[PDB]
Amino acid sequence: TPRIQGLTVEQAEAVVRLSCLPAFKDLIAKVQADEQFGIWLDSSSPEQTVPYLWTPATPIGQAIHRLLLIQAFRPDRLLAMAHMFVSTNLGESF
Non-local CB neighbours of 67 within 8 Å, separated by 6+ positions: 78, 81, 82, 85
Q: Is 43 helix (H, G, I), strand (E, B) or coil?
A: coil
CB within 8 A of 91, min separation 6: which ones? none
Of 85, 93, 91, the closest CA to residue 63 belongs to 85
Tell me which method was used to determine the 3D structure: cryo-EM
